[PDB]
C-alpha cells in the first residue's frame, strides 16, 4: 500500500540544507512511515529521542510532525538537545525543555565540504538575548555593544552578527559538517486509532 507515504525524502535526502541560523521547517501529517529503518540505519551517527522511544515509534500515532533541518559543526551536535547552552542553542536553534521528538544527525563531510573550503553555511555569533524555543533570527542588523547606536556603521562596538562555517576535507570531525533533522511529535492521548 502507498496511499500517502511520509515524504521524509524531501527533508532527509534534500540536495542542500539551510544554515542553522535560518533553519528550515517542514510540516508532516497525513502519512504513515516506519522509524525502525531510520533508527536501524547505519548512516545516522546521532539518533536521540526525548519523551518518546525510537523503536517503539512504529507503535505510536500523533497529530503533527515538524521536520526542522539545518547544518552545524560536528562538536555542536550536543547543543541540539533540551537544556543546552552555547552559540547554537542560544543564538541559532533552541529546543524547549519539554521537547517531545527525535534529534537525527549524520556526517556530511562528503557533500557540504569542498577543497579550499565551503564558506556558505553560516551561524549567528552575536545576539542581545537568547532565543526562545523554535525562534528564528535572520536579521543582519549591525550588532551594538556600546551605548551609541550603530546606525548601519561598522565602527567600534558595531560588527556583523553572522560568520561563515569553513568546511574542508582534511578538518577534524569536531569541525566537519553535520546535517541535523529535528522531528517534533505533537500531543495525543489514548491512541485507539
Amino acid at each position, epitope marked *: 500500500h502507498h496511499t500517502n507515504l511520509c515524504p521524509f525524502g524531501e527533508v532527509f535526502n534534500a540536495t542542500r540544507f539551510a544554515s542553522v541560523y535560518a533553519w528550515n521547517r517542514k510540516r508532516i501529517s497525513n502519512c504513515v512511515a516506519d522509524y525502525s529503518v531510520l533508527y536501524n540505519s547505519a548512516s545516522f551517527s546521532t539518533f536521540k529521542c526525548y519523551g518518546v522511544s525510537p*523503536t517503539k515509534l512504529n507503535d505510536l500515532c500523533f497529530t503533527n510532525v515538524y521536520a526542522d533541518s539545518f547544518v552545524i559543526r560536528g562538536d555542536e551536535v*550536543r547543543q541540539i538537545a533540551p537544556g543546552q547552552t552555547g552559540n547554537i542553542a542560544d543564538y541559532n536553534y533552541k529546543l524547549p525543555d519539554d521537547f517531545t521528538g527525535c534529534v537525527i544527525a549524520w556526517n556530511s563531510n562528503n557533500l557540504d565540504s569542498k577543497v579550499g573550503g565551503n564558506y556558505n553555511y553560516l551561524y549567528r555569533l552575536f545576539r542581545k538575548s537568547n532565543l526562545k524555543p523554535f525562534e528564528r533570527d535572520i536579521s543582519t542588523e549591525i550588532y551594538q555593544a556600546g551605548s551609541t547606536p550603530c546606525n548601519g556603521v561598522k565602527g567600534f562596538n558595531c560588527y556583523f552578527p553572522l560568520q561563515s562555517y569553513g568546511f574542508q576535507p582534511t578538518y577534524g570531525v569536531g569541525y566537519q559538517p553535520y546535517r541535523v533533522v529535528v522531528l517534533s511529535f505533537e500531543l495525543l492521548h489514548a491512541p485507539a486509532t
Partner: nanobody
Amino acid sequence: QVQLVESGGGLVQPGGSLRLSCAASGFTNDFYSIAWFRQAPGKEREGVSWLSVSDNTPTYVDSVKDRFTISRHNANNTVYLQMNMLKPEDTAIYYCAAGRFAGRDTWPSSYDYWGQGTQVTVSS
C-alpha cells in the same frame, strides 16, 4: 545520585573473550540509554556499542558487529558488553556512559554520566 559502576577488563590473547559490565544505580525509570566508548592509545573516545534501555535495541559499529554483543540484565540493572574474537585493535580503555534519552550518539560529550574506565589489552 546517578552512578555508573564498571568492571570486567583484563589481559587476553588474540581471539579470546571478555565480558564488561556497567551497573546503573540512580535512575528513576528505564528511560535512559547506555553507550560503550573505547579510547585507544593516542586516540579519542570512540563509541562501539549502544543500547536504548526502554527499547532494548542494540547498535554496533561495523568493526565489532558480529564479534560484540550488548545486553542488559533486569534485576541487577546492569548492561553487559560481550566481546568475542578479540583482536589487537580492540586494545583500549573502555568506558560506559548513560544519558536521559532513548537512542545513541557518537559524541562522548552528549552523555552526562560516566563510569570509571577499565583496561582491555589484547596481545600475545
